[PDB]
């Protein structure tokens, strides 16, 4: 497997402060094809996670200039010349250049302290365990099915970074975390346009909250552009 080391997890920060946050991977991140899938992620509080770079080094549409990526092979580095008061959240990078695609432990960018293509992820689900869900995720916007296209599925446990659980392809090429020990599977309605993951036998360990998140185009060298806003499993 790969592990994205990142660092600082803390990187308390001032407004209008210079922030850096870094990558190291196990290993290389390089295809084979060419490009290094790194990106960087960030996730403001209440929200899901949010693409800001995709391919190490590219700043994803809408994403402020002074975001920027600059890595290479092994080490990456996030860089804000300026953060503002939006900037503040965990950011995390993610390689998505090996199977399983990983993520940083993440980062809180915090304030130091003193003086339209749209997924939505069918509602929270509490089940006993043993049981299973399905959750759904709902893609709109875009055509479940242009090349380059697909899902992924993250999970993001309280305290357990995001994990990648699944991914399904437009050409129907569904791939799972064999973390998850063969208990999901990927289905899509093409028609309701909907993928759904179902996860297969629940203990408490699968309570996350989960989001599928497209992988964008070969545009966006597979970067997961756009996120659902999350729905959480809790198993009881």
């Known amino acids: 497997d790969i592990v994205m080391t990142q660092t600082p997890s803390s990187l308390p920060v001032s407004l209008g402060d210079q922030a850096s946050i870094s990558c190291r991977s196990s290993?290389?991140?390089?295809?084979?094809?060419?490009?290094?899938?790194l990106e960087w992620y960030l996730q403001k509080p209440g929200q899901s996670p949010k693409l800001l770079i995709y391919?190490?080094?590219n700043r994803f549409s809408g994403v402020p200039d002074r975001f920027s990526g600059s890595g290479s092979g092994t080490d990456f580095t996030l860089k804000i010349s300026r953060v503002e008061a939006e900037d503040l959240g965990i950011y995390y990078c993610?390689?998505?250049?090996?199977?399983?695609?990983?993520f940083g432990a993440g980062t809180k960018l915090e304030l130091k302290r003193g003086g339209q293509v749209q997924l939505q992820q069918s509602g929270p689900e509490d089940v006993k365990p043993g049981a299973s869900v399905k959750i759904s995720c709902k893609a709109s916007?875009?055509?479940?099915?242009?090349?380059?296209?697909?899902v992924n599925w993250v999970k993001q446990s309280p305290g357990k970074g995001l994990e990648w659980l699944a991914h399904?392809?437009?050409?129907?090429?569904?791939r799972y975390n064999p973390s998850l020990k063969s208990r999901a599977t990927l289905t899509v309605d093409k028609t309701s346009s909907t993928v759904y993951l179902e996860l297969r036998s629940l203990t408490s360990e699968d309570s996350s909250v989960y989001y599928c998140?497209?992988?964008?185009?070969?545009?966006?060298?597979?970067?997961?552009?756009?996120w659902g806003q999350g729905t959480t499993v809790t198993v009881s």
């Open positions: 399904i392809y437009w050409d129907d090429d569904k």
């Open positions: 391919k190490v080094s």
């Open positions: 993610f390689q998505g250049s090996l199977v399983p695609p990983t």
């Open positions: 916007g875009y055509s479940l099915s242009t090349s380059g296209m697909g």
């Open positions: 290993q290389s991140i390089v295809h084979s094809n060419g490009n290094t899938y």
């Open positions: 998140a497209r992988r964008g185009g070969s545009s966006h060298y597979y970067a997961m552009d756009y």
